[PDB]
Design an enzyme around this catalytic site. Structure first.
Site, PDB file in Angstrom:
ATOM      1  N   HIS A  10       0.767  -1.191  -0.077  1.00 15.45           N
ATOM      2  CA  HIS A  10      -0.129   0.116  -0.030  1.00 15.45           C
ATOM      3  C   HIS A  10       0.825   1.198  -0.039  1.00 15.45           C
ATOM      4  O   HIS A  10       0.998   1.831   0.883  1.00 15.45           O
ATOM      5  CB  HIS A  10      -0.915  -0.049   1.069  1.00 15.45           C
ATOM      6  N   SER A  57       5.113   0.098   7.918  1.00 10.41           N
ATOM      7  CA  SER A  57       5.767  -1.108   7.958  1.00 10.41           C
ATOM      8  C   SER A  57       6.612  -1.189   6.538  1.00 10.41           C
ATOM      9  O   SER A  57       7.704  -1.678   6.615  1.00 10.41           O
ATOM     10  CB  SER A  57       4.915  -2.370   8.070  1.00 10.41           C
ATOM     11  N   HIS A  63      -1.003   0.966  13.393  1.00  7.78           N
ATOM     12  CA  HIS A  63      -0.950   0.404  11.993  1.00  7.78           C
ATOM     13  C   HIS A  63      -1.602  -0.928  12.093  1.00  7.78           C
ATOM     14  O   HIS A  63      -2.601  -0.766  12.153  1.00  7.78           O
ATOM     15  CB  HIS A  63       0.624   0.454  11.910  1.00  7.78           C
ATOM     16  N   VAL A 121     -11.169   4.935  17.697  1.00  4.01           N
ATOM     17  CA  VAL A 121     -11.970   3.930  17.193  1.00  4.01           C
ATOM     18  C   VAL A 121     -11.186   3.316  16.045  1.00  4.01           C
ATOM     19  O   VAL A 121     -10.746   3.649  14.821  1.00  4.01           O
ATOM     20  CB  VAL A 121     -13.069   4.441  16.379  1.00  4.01           C
ATOM     21  N   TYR A 137     -10.847   2.756  11.435  1.00  3.32           N
ATOM     22  CA  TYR A 137     -11.312   4.156  10.830  1.00  3.32           C
ATOM     23  C   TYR A 137     -10.305   4.885  10.675  1.00  3.32           C
ATOM     24  O   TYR A 137      -9.585   5.185  11.692  1.00  3.32           O
ATOM     25  CB  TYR A 137     -12.725   4.403  11.511  1.00  3.32           C
ATOM     26  N   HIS A 151      -7.187   6.967   8.068  1.00  2.00           N
ATOM     27  CA  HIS A 151      -5.812   6.817   7.339  1.00  2.00           C
ATOM     28  C   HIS A 151      -5.130   7.991   7.012  1.00  2.00           C
ATOM     29  O   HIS A 151      -5.872   9.146   6.782  1.00  2.00           O
ATOM     30  CB  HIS A 151      -6.420   6.271   5.800  1.00  2.00           C
ATOM     31  N   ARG A 178     -10.047  -1.816  -0.333  1.00  2.00           N
ATOM     32  CA  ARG A 178      -9.640  -2.899   0.373  1.00  2.00           C
ATOM     33  C   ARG A 178     -10.408  -3.498   1.326  1.00  2.00           C
ATOM     34  O   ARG A 178     -10.883  -4.654   1.229  1.00  2.00           O
ATOM     35  CB  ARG A 178      -8.226  -2.869   0.995  1.00  2.00           C
ATOM     36  N   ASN A 231     -11.300   1.589   7.320  1.00  2.00           N
ATOM     37  CA  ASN A 231     -10.060   0.974   6.376  1.00  2.00           C
ATOM     38  C   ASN A 231     -10.355  -0.329   6.354  1.00  2.00           C
ATOM     39  O   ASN A 231     -10.969  -0.893   7.006  1.00  2.00           O
ATOM     40  CB  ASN A 231      -8.758   1.583   7.053  1.00  2.00           C
ATOM     41  N   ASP A 288      -8.535  -2.942   7.917  1.00  2.00           N
ATOM     42  CA  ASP A 288      -8.337  -3.367   9.229  1.00  2.00           C
ATOM     43  C   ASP A 288      -9.727  -3.738   9.931  1.00  2.00           C
ATOM     44  O   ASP A 288     -10.061  -4.509  10.612  1.00  2.00           O
ATOM     45  CB  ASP A 288      -7.472  -2.729  10.184  1.00  2.00           C
TER      46      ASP A 288
HETATM   47  C1  LIG Z   1      -4.809   5.596  10.578  1.00  2.00           C
HETATM   48  C2  LIG Z   1      -4.427   6.670  11.569  1.00  2.00           C
HETATM   49  C3  LIG Z   1      -3.456   6.300  12.330  1.00  2.00           C
HETATM   50  C4  LIG Z   1      -4.040   7.909  10.738  1.00  2.00           C
HETATM   51  O1  LIG Z   1      -3.455   8.732  11.738  1.00  2.00           O
HETATM   52  P1  LIG Z   1      -3.434  10.302  10.962  1.00  2.00           P
HETATM   53  O2  LIG Z   1      -3.490  10.422   9.679  1.00  2.00           O
HETATM   54  O3  LIG Z   1      -2.274  11.081  11.858  1.00  2.00           O
HETATM   55  O4  LIG Z   1      -4.955  11.046  11.479  1.00  2.00           O
HETATM   56  P2  LIG Z   1      -5.512  12.250  11.214  1.00  2.00           P
HETATM   57  O5  LIG Z   1      -4.553  13.152  10.405  1.00  2.00           O
HETATM   58  O6  LIG Z   1      -7.017  12.021  10.875  1.00  2.00           O
HETATM   59  O7  LIG Z   1      -5.378  12.737  12.550  1.00  2.00           O
HETATM   60  C5  LIG Z   1      -6.215  14.159  13.236  1.00  2.00           C
HETATM   61  C6  LIG Z   1      -6.731  13.662  14.457  1.00  2.00           C
HETATM   62  O8  LIG Z   1      -7.892  12.792  14.476  1.00  2.00           O
HETATM   63  C7  LIG Z   1      -7.633  11.653  15.377  1.00  2.00           C
HETATM   64  N1  LIG Z   1      -7.977  10.522  14.879  1.00  2.00           N
HETATM   65  C8  LIG Z   1      -7.847   9.887  13.385  1.00  2.00           C
HETATM   66  N2  LIG Z   1      -8.532   8.767  13.300  1.00  2.00           N
HETATM   67  C9  LIG Z   1      -9.217   8.444  14.426  1.00  2.00           C
HETATM   68  C10 LIG Z   1      -9.781   7.323  14.945  1.00  2.00           C
HETATM   69  N3  LIG Z   1     -10.157   6.180  14.043  1.00  2.00           N
HETATM   70  N4  LIG Z   1     -10.282   7.382  15.997  1.00  2.00           N
HETATM   71  C11 LIG Z   1     -10.114   8.407  16.819  1.00  2.00           C
HETATM   72  N5  LIG Z   1      -9.323   9.387  16.619  1.00  2.00           N
HETATM   73  C12 LIG Z   1      -8.893   9.373  15.342  1.00  2.00           C
HETATM   74  C13 LIG Z   1      -6.229  11.754  15.542  1.00  2.00           C
HETATM   75  O9  LIG Z   1      -5.807  10.750  16.520  1.00  2.00           O
HETATM   76  C14 LIG Z   1      -5.792  13.071  15.468  1.00  2.00           C
HETATM   77  O10 LIG Z   1      -6.012  13.433  16.761  1.00  2.00           O
HETATM   78  P3  LIG Z   1      -4.939  13.936  17.920  1.00  2.00           P
HETATM   79  O11 LIG Z   1      -4.266  15.054  17.485  1.00  2.00           O
HETATM   80  O12 LIG Z   1      -5.883  14.145  19.073  1.00  2.00           O
HETATM   81  O13 LIG Z   1      -4.186  12.658  18.127  1.00  2.00           O
HETATM   82  C15 LIG Z   1      -5.756   7.240  12.439  1.00  2.00           C
HETATM   83  O14 LIG Z   1      -6.760   7.786  11.736  1.00  2.00           O
HETATM   84  C16 LIG Z   1      -6.387   6.000  13.037  1.00  2.00           C
HETATM   85  O15 LIG Z   1      -7.398   5.513  12.323  1.00  2.00           O
HETATM   86  N6  LIG Z   1      -5.928   5.420  14.135  1.00  2.00           N
HETATM   87  C17 LIG Z   1      -6.449   4.194  14.360  1.00  2.00           C
HETATM   88  C18 LIG Z   1      -5.756   3.188  13.662  1.00  2.00           C
HETATM   89  C19 LIG Z   1      -6.609   2.459  12.854  1.00  2.00           C
HETATM   90  O16 LIG Z   1      -7.849   2.149  13.073  1.00  2.00           O
HETATM   91  N7  LIG Z   1      -6.096   1.873  11.678  1.00  2.00           N
HETATM   92  C20 LIG Z   1      -4.784   1.947  11.212  1.00  2.00           C
HETATM   93  C21 LIG Z   1      -4.761   0.830  10.141  1.00  2.00           C
HETATM   94  S1  LIG Z   1      -4.991   1.974   8.625  1.00  2.00           S
HETATM   95  O1  LIG Z   2      -1.328   2.911   4.687  1.00  2.00           O
HETATM   96  C1  LIG Z   2      -1.119   3.349   5.680  1.00  2.00           C
HETATM   97  O2  LIG Z   2      -0.866   4.546   6.372  1.00  2.00           O
HETATM   98  C2  LIG Z   2      -1.431   2.167   6.718  1.00  2.00           C
HETATM   99  C3  LIG Z   2      -2.374   1.037   6.088  1.00  2.00           C
HETATM  100  O3  LIG Z   2      -3.493   0.868   6.287  1.00  2.00           O
HETATM  101  C4  LIG Z   2      -1.408   0.156   5.229  1.00  2.00           C
HETATM  102  O4  LIG Z   2      -0.176  -0.224   5.080  1.00  2.00           O
HETATM  103  O5  LIG Z   2      -2.236  -0.528   4.196  1.00  2.00           O
END
Ligand SMILES: CC(C)(COP(=O)(O)OP(=O)(O)OC[C@H]1O[C@@H](n2cnc3c(N)ncnc32)[C@H](O)[C@@H]1OP(=O)(O)O)[C@@H](O)C(=O)NCCC(=O)NCCS
Ligand SMILES: O=C([O-])CC(=O)C(=O)O
Ligand SMILES: O=C([O-])CC(=O)C(=O)O
Ligand SMILES: O=C([O-])CC(=O)C(=O)O
Lengths: 435, 435
Positions: free
Chosen positions: A239, A245, A275, A316, A319, A321, A330, A376, A378
């Site tokens: 991806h 990773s 991740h 949560v 949800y 990315h 996906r 997403n 996951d």
């Molecule tokens: C995927 C993820 C890590 C991306 O991070 P990111 O790109 O930095 O997220 P954003 O730019 O949307 O972040 C802005 C804010 O929204 C929050 N946020 C984003 N997605 C969130 C979620 N699913 N639940 C709660 N809060 C979330 C972030 O923590 C951040 O807040 P903060 O300043 O209080 O930390 C994040 O959206 C997330 O989903 N975290 C949970 C991990 C997950 O469910 N999936 C990972 C596999 S793709």
């Molecule tokens: O793309 C990302 O940032 C994390 C992810 O969900 C993947 O590796 O598929």
């Protein structure tokens, strides 16, 4: 015989090198800006790295060499049984930029079966893990421990010419790919290490099938799951380069650590809750919700459980990315796999995942922190394994680890072939940004 | 009793957070450009990440919170014996931004002795390694295996608020710091695992002393080496965020992997020939030269050996740097350690290193390929360990691994305290750069 994978690679190497030479002539061209947000926001939105086999569109999702998931599902060869695209064919595509014939993939699947055996010391190492050690910790360790088998490390240490780095890198990548399913199976089955560690693979079968066999889910009666696993592994292979990773694998690779060490670091990054450990976290979170809300529940019960989770200062899972701003194709592909299987749609845990995808985005938007309120991959992957009898969510990211070897190992081979240098950004402190 | 390290940290946290809030208001401000060179050249020169405790000055070399190495050598507390700055005091400085009192460091050294013990399984795991397994592979694995001891991972898994991340991260960082010397000693001494793995540390002695004791170099007769080890570990603790090991630790950390997993990935990056192995490469290169030129040699003998090395298309190890354009003050500090020790100055191998530093830069400049003809810290570090009886250069990156825990663990604590997000850049393919 049609050309084998290594030969197929060699044909496309000179063309890629010539393109690299041309892109290099334009080194000085400005393609973007760095802002403060980029520095403090974990390089968000910053096009700063080269990844060849896949590029991610925020609106439209992933493309592998310009091909969509659906394009790959149609074009990539299938197994001897089943309807789903093979990960090994995805690997071929990622690496060569060309779709393999079914013959070529069969030859390649056969090589992967042949090279899956492990040295005794890896078995001893895995046997030393206490039962409570996290499975991703186990997986990461065992992959790094296989660096004793590294041709690249031994060849580098002996003296080796820069142009020929890719061949040992490639040899190691294939070796790691063949072995990792078995390693992953040893993590799943700690009490059966001597049997699982040495058991012969069906030589005529695809990678996913053999991974299922080692998991204890082989044969005709498990063929539906073989199809799920095939799809799943091919969807999670790559991806782009920015994901933790892939990046970690590249980063550690760029200092000329071999692919076992490099992808070990990938796996360590994949073990992060934000991740791939999200796959685990999603299903644990869903099961917790089920226990709280019960068998008969309202939309509000789900809404409240999400809001309570956010108000606890937790994410949560499943949800959001770093790049995507729409539901992940996906994720949709895994939901569509479920759509044709009425027993899966009848599974209350899957129904809860589905229901949660209809409610979570609004709630996440109301919370207003996230850039992307949509699900997403996951969100959906773990419930599907649960359905087929893999009910211990602590192991879910382990299966992802097997998949996510694909894209990053491809990229390492290309990194070595191109002569890409060490990855070395500049840092700065907050006082330096303030000035 | 003066404030302990954790309390010292807590006092400076709100001020850092306020500064972060202010820098964040200026998110949209443009601080630089991305070019094609940045994408293809491993993000070189691209200000893309936050690192608080150290910044690199082109004229003056690394500074820790604005203080030079010499400033740190003078100001940082010493041990109960010896003249060299303690790494634990360097850690304190890195973390808090303030110089600790000797009392404060003694209390901190005592806590490090108390927490150095390992679970039995780590001993069993290390015992499983074959004798031939590379030492950095061993070190990386054992550090990752200590994630069974992670408070952060267990707290995260139990449900934990984002605001409370740093305390478990800090607890884990201290735990890893206390334990890693012992782990490192087990790698050095595979035949002494039961003794070294369980031996009680003198709680009234500093980290480096106890690390020397576990190495078999305790007591008054080895006090010079205690001082070397102290200096060495304090000098290698941190060198900005862009270096592979620091970065990898941060990167894997940003997905909320615990500090054992995160710094395991650091160590995997440190195992890379282009990163961690230079100290070893220098001494092998120097011993090769010595065998040819002998104990008594002329400038020309050295000049010829360098020219031959460069004309063979190889680097002269320990000279050059991705950032530095002057002689490294870390290098100078190690040479000055030797300056007060007449037995070291009399060592022909050290004299050869010294002589080589007088001749290599001119030769490198005449060759004209390198941007930086000056010596880096790796040029001097190995010969000094060799002088004190550590004559297997293969293990020198292991001692670096002990040192390089310091800065990156500090940064992780700050990352969690600030609430920095996941590191997730955008990638692009060559075809995308071409268009
Ligand atoms: C995927 C993820 C890590 C991306 O991070 P990111 O790109 O930095 O997220 P954003 O730019 O949307 O972040 C802005 C804010 O929204 C929050 N946020 C984003 N997605 C969130 C979620 N699913 N639940 C709660 N809060 C979330 C972030 O923590 C951040 O807040 P903060 O300043 O209080 O930390 C994040 O959206 C997330 O989903 N975290 C949970 C991990 C997950 O469910 N999936 C990972 C596999 S793709
Ligand atoms: O793309 C990302 O940032 C994390 C992810 O969900 C993947 O590796 O598929
Ligand atoms: O329930 C768990 O956490 C997993 C478990 O007991 C095991 O199989 O080791
Ligand atoms: O090795 C490096 O990247 C730094 C260097 O010497 C050069 O660019 O000439």
């Amino acid at each position: 015989a049609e050309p084998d994978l290594k030969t197929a690679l060699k044909a496309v190497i000179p063309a890629k090198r010539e393109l690299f030479k041309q892109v290099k002539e334009r080194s000085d061209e400005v393609i973007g800006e760095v802002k403060v947000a980029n520095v403090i926001g974990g390089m968000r939105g910053l096009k700063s790295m080269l990844w060849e086999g896949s590029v991610l569109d925020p609106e439209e999702g992933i493309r592998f060499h310009g091909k969509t998931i659906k394009d790959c599902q149609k074009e990539l060869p299938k197994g001897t049984s089943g309807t789903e695209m093979l990960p090994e064919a995805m690997f071929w595509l990622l690496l060569t930029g060309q779709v393999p014939s079914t013959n070529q993939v069969r030859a390649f699947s056969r090589e992967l079966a042949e090279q899956s055996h492990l040295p005794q010391h890896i078995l001893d190492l895995i046997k030393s893990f206490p039962r409570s050690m996290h499975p991703m910790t186990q997986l990461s360790i065992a992959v790094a421990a296989l660096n004793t088998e590294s041709k690249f490390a031994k060849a580098y240490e002996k003296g080796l010419s820069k142009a020929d780095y890719w061949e040992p890198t490639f040899d190691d990548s294939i070796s790691l790919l063949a072995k990792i399913p078995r390693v992953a199976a040893l993590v799943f089955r700690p009490d059966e290490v001597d049997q699982v560690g040495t058991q012969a693979l069906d030589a005529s079968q695809d990678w996913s099938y053999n991974f299922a066999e080692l998991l204890g889910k082989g044969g005709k009666e498990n063929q539906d799951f073989h199809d799920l696993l095939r799809l799943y592994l091919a969807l999670h292979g790559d991806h782009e380069g920015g994901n933790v990773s892939a990046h970690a694998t590249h980063l550690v690779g760029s200092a000329l650590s071999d692919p076992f060490l490099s992808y070990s670091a990938g796996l360590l990054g994949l073990a992060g809750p934000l991740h791939g450990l999200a796959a685990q976290e999603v299903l644990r979170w869903i099961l917790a919700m089920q226990d709280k809300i019960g068998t008969k529940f309202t939309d509000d019960d789900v809404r409240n459980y999400l809001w309570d989770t956010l108000k606890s200062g937790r994410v949560v899972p499943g949800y959001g990315h770093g790049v995507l701003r729409k539901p992940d194709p996906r994720f949709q592909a895994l939901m569509d796999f479920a759509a044709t299987r009425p027993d899966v749609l009848a599974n209350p845990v899957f129904q809860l995942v589905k229901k949660n995808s209809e409610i979570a985005p609004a709630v996440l938007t109301e919370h207003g922190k996230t850039k992307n309120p949509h699900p997403n991959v996951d969100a959906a992957s773990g419930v599907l394994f649960y359905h087929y009898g893999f009910q211990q969510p602590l192991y879910y990211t382990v299966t992802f680890g097997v998949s996510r070897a694909l894209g990053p190992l491809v990229q390492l081979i290309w990194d070595r072939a191109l002569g890409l240098p060490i990855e070395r950004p500049k840092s700065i402190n907050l006082l330096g940004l303030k000035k």
